[PDB]
Each structure stands twice: as C-alpha cells, then as structure tokens.
Amino acid sequence: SPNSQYLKTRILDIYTPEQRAGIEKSEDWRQFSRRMDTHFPKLMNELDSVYGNNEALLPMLEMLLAQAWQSYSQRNSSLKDIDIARENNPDWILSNKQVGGVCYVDLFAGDLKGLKDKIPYFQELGLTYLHLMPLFKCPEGKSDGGYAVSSYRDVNPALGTIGDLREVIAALHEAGISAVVDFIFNHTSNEHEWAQRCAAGDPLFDNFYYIFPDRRMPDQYDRTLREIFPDQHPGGFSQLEDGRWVWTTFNSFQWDLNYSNPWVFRAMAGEMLFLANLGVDILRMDAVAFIWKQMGTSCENLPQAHALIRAFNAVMRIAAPAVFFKSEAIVHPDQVVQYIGQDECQIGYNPLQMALLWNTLATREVNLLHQALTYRHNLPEHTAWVNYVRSHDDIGWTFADEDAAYLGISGYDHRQFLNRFFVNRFDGSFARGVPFQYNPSTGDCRVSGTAAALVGLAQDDPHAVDRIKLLYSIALSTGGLPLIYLGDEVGTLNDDDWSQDSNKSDDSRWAHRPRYNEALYAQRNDPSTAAGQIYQDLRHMIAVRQSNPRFDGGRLVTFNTNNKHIIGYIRNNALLAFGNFSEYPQTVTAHTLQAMPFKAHDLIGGKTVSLNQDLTLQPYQVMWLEIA
Ligand SMILES: OC[C@H]1O[C@@H](O)[C@H](O)[C@@H](O)[C@@H]1O
Ligand SMILES: OC[C@H]1O[C@@H](O)[C@H](O)[C@@H](O)[C@@H]1O
Ligand SMILES: OC[C@H]1O[C@@H](O)[C@H](O)[C@@H](O)[C@@H]1O
Structure with missing residues (x-):
C-alpha cells in the first residue's frame, strides 16, 4: 500500500512547476501536509481492511485525496480556525457547558x-x-x-x-x-440521480446499490435479516417494476448504498x-x-x-x-x-x-x-x-x-x-x-x-x-x-x-x-x-x-441507595444525585448515608439537606447534592 509522502507528490502534479512551488510554501498546504502524515496511515489501513487488493482502491484513494486537498484549500478561514481549536481540545464534547x-x-x-x-x-x-x-x-x-x-x-x-x-x-x-x-x-431515495442511473444500466453508476434478478439471493439473505419496518415489506428487499429486487432495509423507496x-x-x-x-x-x-x-x-x-x-x-x-x-x-x-x-x-x-x-x-x-x-x-x-x-x-x-x-x-x-x-x-x-x-x-x-x-x-x-x-x-x-x-x-x-x-x-x-x-x-x-x-x-x-x-x-460511579425505587450516582466525587421513580414517598436511610457529609446543599430545590438522618424524597423528586 502507498505512503503519505509519495501520494502528496502526486496530488501536486496538477500544478505547473511555477504554481507548485507556490503551493509548497503556502500555509494551507503545510497544514494539510502535516495532517496527512499524521492521519493518512489510519485511512490507508482502514480502506485496506475493507477493499484489500481491489484494483480500484488506489485510483479511488488518489482521487479522494485530490478532492480532499481541493476541499481544504477552499475551506473558509473561520472554519480553519475551528479546525485548529478542536484539534487541540478533543474533549470539547465532554464539557458540562x-x-x-x-x-x-x-x-x-x-x-x-x-x-x-x-x-x-x-x-x-x-x-x-x-x-x-x-x-x-x-x-x-x-x-x-x-x-x-x-x-x-x-x-x-x-x-x-x-x-x-x-x-x-x-x-x-x-x-x-x-x-x-x-x-x-x-441509503438514498429511489428518485436520487445515482439510483436512477444505476437501475438504468449507466456504467458510471454500476454497482452503486444491491440489485438482484430474482428472489434467489434475497431469500437467502432474509434468513438472517431483522425487519425494521415490517409494516412496509418483509425481509430487506423490494421489487422494481421490471421484476428485479433491490436491497431496502427501510422503506421500499430507500435503496441501500453499496x-x-x-x-x-x-x-x-x-x-x-x-x-x-x-x-x-x-x-x-x-x-x-x-x-x-x-x-x-x-x-x-x-x-x-x-x-x-x-x-x-x-x-x-x-x-x-x-x-x-x-x-x-x-x-x-x-x-x-x-x-x-x-x-x-x-x-x-x-x-x-x-x-x-x-x-x-x-x-x-x-x-x-x-x-x-x-x-x-x-x-x-x-x-x-x-x-x-x-x-x-x-x-x-x-x-x-x-x-x-x-x-x-x-x-x-x-x-x-x-x-x-x-x-x-x-x-x-x-x-x-x-x-x-x-x-x-x-x-x-x-x-x-x-x-x-x-x-x-x-x-x-x-x-x-x-x-x-x-x-x-x-x-x-x-x-x-x-x-x-x-x-x-x-x-x-x-x-x-x-x-x-x-x-x-x-x-x-x-x-x-x-x-x-x-x-x-x-x-x-x-x-x-x-x-x-x-x-x-x-x-x-x-x-x-x-x-x-x-x-x-x-464518568460516573453509582451509589447503592438500598431503596429499589431510588437511583443514585456520583459525579466527580462531588455531586450525589438521587432520583425517586415511585409515585409515593421513598426513603434513603441514615444507615445508608453514614459516609456522607452531615449537610449538603441540594441544587434542585435550593435547600440544605441533612444526611445524618433518614432522607425522604417526595414522589418523583430529584436531588443534586453537593458533597464536595
Ligand atoms: O432512514 C431510516 C431511518 O434512519 C434513522 O437514522 C432515522 O433516525 C429514522 O428516522 C429513519 O427512519
Ligand atoms: O405488572 C406487573 C409485572 O408484570 C410483568 O409482566 C413485568 O415484566 C414486570 O416488570 C411488572 O412489574
Ligand atoms: O457506611 C455507609 C455504608 O455502610 C455499609 O456497611 C452499608 O451496607 C451501606 O449501605 C452504607 O452506605
């Protein structure tokens, strides 16, 4: 399988000598080049595990990389700033904010x-x-x-x-x-250009979907397929007006991409x-x-x-x-x-x-x-x-x-x-x-x-x-x-x-x-x-x-409330949450709460709660206690 350096030299082949020299010194090419070296190995490894020695893999990959460079070059500066921001803050998705x-x-x-x-x-x-x-x-x-x-x-x-x-x-x-x-x-709709052209026999869209001549293969596949919308059709296939069958996991008008x-x-x-x-x-x-x-x-x-x-x-x-x-x-x-x-x-x-x-x-x-x-x-x-x-x-x-x-x-x-x-x-x-x-x-x-x-x-x-x-x-x-x-x-x-x-x-x-x-x-x-x-x-x-x-x-750690109707868990060893799923009052005993601070503020109701005695929650009440 090819390497990042080699592939990059081919990406730049679309440029004349004079243009190429300028691209090589550009900021966009420097960022793209760095990311390619870091992440291309994963792209290649994943594609290889799926397609293996497929004759179309290398040509497809080079076409994809060429598009990727053009896409990044076109990308707005503001978006590029966000790219760098998240590249260095992978946990932005984990913030409580x-x-x-x-x-x-x-x-x-x-x-x-x-x-x-x-x-x-x-x-x-x-x-x-x-x-x-x-x-x-x-x-x-x-x-x-x-x-x-x-x-x-x-x-x-x-x-x-x-x-x-x-x-x-x-x-x-x-x-x-x-x-x-x-x-x-x-999947795409059956009215999508790709679907129409594939079904029509256009070689450019050959094998873009899964189409069969009869029920032979569909019947075999159906032995192990789960029905998502059984109300719409059985198994995972729908029949075309010309008699052929197409893979449709969901509605008949949704054709699974190949x-x-x-x-x-x-x-x-x-x-x-x-x-x-x-x-x-x-x-x-x-x-x-x-x-x-x-x-x-x-x-x-x-x-x-x-x-x-x-x-x-x-x-x-x-x-x-x-x-x-x-x-x-x-x-x-x-x-x-x-x-x-x-x-x-x-x-x-x-x-x-x-x-x-x-x-x-x-x-x-x-x-x-x-x-x-x-x-x-x-x-x-x-x-x-x-x-x-x-x-x-x-x-x-x-x-x-x-x-x-x-x-x-x-x-x-x-x-x-x-x-x-x-x-x-x-x-x-x-x-x-x-x-x-x-x-x-x-x-x-x-x-x-x-x-x-x-x-x-x-x-x-x-x-x-x-x-x-x-x-x-x-x-x-x-x-x-x-x-x-x-x-x-x-x-x-x-x-x-x-x-x-x-x-x-x-x-x-x-x-x-x-x-x-x-x-x-x-x-x-x-x-x-x-x-x-x-x-x-x-x-x-x-x-x-x-x-x-x-x-x-x-991350969280559950807390055993000893009450089958009350869920309890702790966040960052500082917030103890209790949730009563009963339509009746439910208690967490003083015995269960012995290791907790004597007092704790409840962020939900805004009151100070005593934990050195039985704690009774009203029907469906939720408490967020600050224990640290
Ligand atoms: O397209 C098939 C299904 O895709 C899911 O991702 C959607 O959540 C669901 O609404 C839809 O029916
Ligand atoms: O309604 C009484 C019980 O009926 C059972 O069929 C349910 O599985 C159980 O969860 C429920 O508590
Ligand atoms: O110390 C507080 C812990 O004491 C344990 O021995 C009890 O089984 C437990 O329910 C209580 O939470």
Whole structure:
C-alpha cells in the first residue's frame, strides 16, 4: 500500500512547476501536509481492511485525496480556525457547558428564515448545540420525514435555499451554537440521480446499490435479516417494476448504498466534504449498523462497517478537523458502544439509558437502570454519550436480554409488558402512546408518543410534570451531551392530525412530531401552567449543569441507595444525585448515608439537606447534592 509522502507528490502534479512551488510554501498546504502524515496511515489501513487488493482502491484513494486537498484549500478561514481549536481540545464534547436541542425546521419554525428568527429563543434556553432534521431534497409525499434523500446538496425548497441554510449556520455560530445535521449515508431515495442511473444500466453508476434478478439471493439473505419496518415489506428487499429486487432495509423507496464498491465510498466522502465546508460541526451518522452486508450474517455491525466509519473519520482529520461524528446505532448495548471512539464516532446516542428511563417509570424499579449506569456508562477517553429522553423516532426496548436475565428478568415477557403499558393497554397505566411496527411474527413492537403523552400530561396526571423533570434531570447529569427534543420543554402533546393524513397514516412516529405549539410557548413564563412549570424546571437544571464544574466530563460511579425505587450516582466525587421513580414517598436511610457529609446543599430545590438522618424524597423528586 502507498505512503503519505509519495501520494502528496502526486496530488501536486496538477500544478505547473511555477504554481507548485507556490503551493509548497503556502500555509494551507503545510497544514494539510502535516495532517496527512499524521492521519493518512489510519485511512490507508482502514480502506485496506475493507477493499484489500481491489484494483480500484488506489485510483479511488488518489482521487479522494485530490478532492480532499481541493476541499481544504477552499475551506473558509473561520472554519480553519475551528479546525485548529478542536484539534487541540478533543474533549470539547465532554464539557458540562454543552446542551443540545433538535427540531424539524418546517414543524418548529416553518422555514429556514423562520428558524433563524428562533435563535434568540435557543440562546434563552441555553443551547450550544442544534440538530436540524433532514434539510435536503426528497420525494414529495412519503419520504420517511426527509430520510429518503434525492439530493445531498439541493435544499428542500419548502424549507428555503442553500443560501438560507448558510445564513442559518452563520447565525448559529454567531450565537455560540454548533450546527448539527444528518449524514444519511446508508441509503438514498429511489428518485436520487445515482439510483436512477444505476437501475438504468449507466456504467458510471454500476454497482452503486444491491440489485438482484430474482428472489434467489434475497431469500437467502432474509434468513438472517431483522425487519425494521415490517409494516412496509418483509425481509430487506423490494421489487422494481421490471421484476428485479433491490436491497431496502427501510422503506421500499430507500435503496441501500453499496459500500462494497470503493467508488461509493469516494462518492459519499465527497458529500461529507461538502457538508464540512458549509460549516457543519457535527454529522449524525445515520444507520451506521447497516453499511456492510454479508450472506449468512445479520448484516448489522459487521467489521467492515466499523472500518468504513473510521476511514470517514480519517478523511475529516485530514480535510476538516472541526467535524465530529455522532453515531446513531439503535442496537444491542454490546454493539452500540463499539461505534464510539476518538477514531470512529466521537459521540453516540445512548439508547440504553433512554429506554431504561422509560422502563423505570413503568416498573418503578431502578434495577435495570442501575445496572446500566454501573457497567455500561463509562466510555474511552475523548468520547461521550448523547443522552436523551425522546427523539423523532419510536422508543425501542434495546436493553440486553443477557443483562436482564442476570436480574431474573425475561426480556421477551418484559417487553410485552412495557409495550402494553406505554400504549395504555395495561390497567392503571398513565401512558398514552401508540404502537409502532408491531411484528406478529416476532412479537416485537416499539412505542410512539411525545414525552408529555407518555408521562400522562394529556389527561392532566398530577405527577406528569414531575416525571418529565425527573427524566430530563438524568440525561442532564449522568455525563455526556444531553439532547432536548424541542417541544418537550413546554410539555407538547401528540399531534392529532397524523392518523388521518394519508401520507402519514402508516407511520405512527408522526404522533410525536407535532408542530410548534404557540399556546404552550406563550405560557413558558407562567408558573401556574404545566408549560411554565416544565420550562422553568428544565431551564433551571440546564443553568446548574452549565455553570457547575461538578457535572463536567462523562464518568460516573453509582451509589447503592438500598431503596429499589431510588437511583443514585456520583459525579466527580462531588455531586450525589438521587432520583425517586415511585409515585409515593421513598426513603434513603441514615444507615445508608453514614459516609456522607452531615449537610449538603441540594441544587434542585435550593435547600440544605441533612444526611445524618433518614432522607425522604417526595414522589418523583430529584436531588443534586453537593458533597464536595
Ligand atoms: O432512514 C431510516 C431511518 O434512519 C434513522 O437514522 C432515522 O433516525 C429514522 O428516522 C429513519 O427512519
Ligand atoms: O405488572 C406487573 C409485572 O408484570 C410483568 O409482566 C413485568 O415484566 C414486570 O416488570 C411488572 O412489574
Ligand atoms: O457506611 C455507609 C455504608 O455502610 C455499609 O456497611 C452499608 O451496607 C451501606 O449501605 C452504607 O452506605
């Protein structure tokens, strides 16, 4: 395999002798050259592990490196300053100062111009990170909410223009907010130029997707494939009008890209560089688990998938150091953590904590949550979790059956209960969610519904507001970057139009993708309303988190509370957090608290608490005690 020095001499061959001499002495070339020497070894090693002696690897690599240099040369000076800043501050993602929010531009603010006008609010809330849902062109009508991309560079006209997007990004940076967008790299819409040309037989796009003549191979693959949207189609394939079959992990109009073709990697690396130069700070790597297929396997979390992501990482280390990755892997806990690393995805969603927060509200027992925080929370240096309560997606019960069995819990029976409970098919449940993708062949099912709907705010459950406060307190204090599903801070309920919308009726996730509720947002400063109670409560916690150094970093040590309903953990050996998941008062005994300081200030309620006696927490009460 080639070396950095040799490859760089070929990159410069596009220049005449006179021009070349000037490039060699330029600052941009010096920075690029240094990064190449440092990071190229990883790029080469990762690409070699995937493609091996493929005749197309070297040509593809040289084309990619040439593009990378051109991309870096074009990169704006301001962005280059951020590149250097983060190159020397790898833990910027682990700071307690960070708090993120996510929203759909159209649903939250109408269009990109309208979103820019909401920035003052984001600053008011304390956000330093903003994830904007799919912004580029997609099919009209059904597009999996923008996740079926028809173009990676042309902005959805309904939202605005590329010009508007640049203004929004610039405005976000001006307000001290990082711009986060999706990198939908596992598949494109069936209307994307690449898809059309591949299917049409254009040799330039040969093997850009996985297309078969009949069901022979698809049938073989289906023996081991998990169904993501069983309501849409069985297995992982859809049939074209001409009779052929195509790999479609998700909707039939979403065609999986073929990374076994090195030219597909190059193509996607090019799109990544485009996003990088728009000023994006973090790319949400969508459906990372599915980017490599292999007959006889689940075609999820395969070795080459991880290698390809690390190759993409190296490209950014060389051509846009400021760009970090956020892994979106909603899979088994053992597999989730494998995507997280300084050289792969620096941050990643923490579905286990999220799923268990809801599990605990249902069961009132913190056993599973305590187990996860004890054995699956701490991560390698320079990496962090993205902790959340809700997202634009359904809730999947992705806890480990092996972990549960150790606690004497049957994963299958337990999920049956959780599903019944959250869709209000269990006596006394306070949840008002709706099922998503019930699979009668496996019995699996997920839950749709907003955070407020799931805690009982729809029917005005007196404990709803407190449940919301408790869940968010944990995402905000365990260690990692907390992400607020915008709308949750004022208790937004489910959308009640989706069910009758023919373009949404078959995807219950729309139940929890409501529009900006003008009425609730206008009540955020009124302490007598649920909206104001939730807003001030969350805003207070955000304020404490960002101003108090005891929350810095992502490590934690659990504390045995000796009360099955109370979770407890310590941050930096200075902040003791207790969370009561029971709708009844619960106590931590004086005996349990003997090693703690006699007194400690509670940052939540603002009072001094005595720890030399029984400590009783009110229903769903949360305490953040300064013990150092
Ligand atoms: O595109 C398929 C899926 O990709 C995921 O990254 C998105 O979170 C989900 O909403 C979408 O359905
Ligand atoms: O509802 C009572 C019990 O039912 C079981 O099916 C659940 O797995 C358990 O968590 C719950 O406490
Ligand atoms: O010293 C405080 C510790 O004492 C131990 O012997 C108790 O089992 C434990 O619950 C308490 O936290």
